[PDB]
Design a protein around this ligand. Structure first.
Ligand code: HEM
Length: 82
């Protein structure tokens, strides 16, 4: 599926923007941190699906209603924002 359509449909848009921080981090900032680190895509994909806490602040990202192929698609698209 298309990452831009997923970003809207799966509710990501409610907590994230690409350039500014809303509830979670800006995607440009995420892409910058995980730069070109080996294995980052799989690691972000897991956090998109099962949740995250502590990396960008004290508040959690709740687990998302996405499948594994959807999380990989989204992780790859977030990293391309750098
Ligand atoms: C929609 C399915 C969605 C995506 C995609 C997404 C991605 C995402 C990334 C890549 C991160 C960074 C994870 C890390 O660096 O390991 C991240 C972080 C947070 N998110 Fe998110 N996110 C999506 C959806 C949502 C929703 C709906 C919310 C708000 C309820 C939300 C919130 C957060 C927060 C907060 C973080 C920070 C977690 C941290 O460790 O501090 N996300 N998200």
């Amino acid at each position: 599926e298309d990452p831009e359509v997923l970003f809207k449909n799966k509710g990501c848009v409610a907590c994230h923007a690409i350039d500014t921080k809303m509830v979670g981090p800006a995607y440009k900032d995420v892409a910058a941190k995980f730069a070109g680190q080996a294995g980052a895509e799989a690691e972000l994909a897991q956090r998109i699906k099962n949740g995250s806490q502590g990396v960008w602040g004290p508040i959690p990202m709740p687990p998302n209603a996405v499948s594994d192929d959807e999380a990989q698609t989204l992780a790859k698209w977030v990293l391309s924002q750098k």
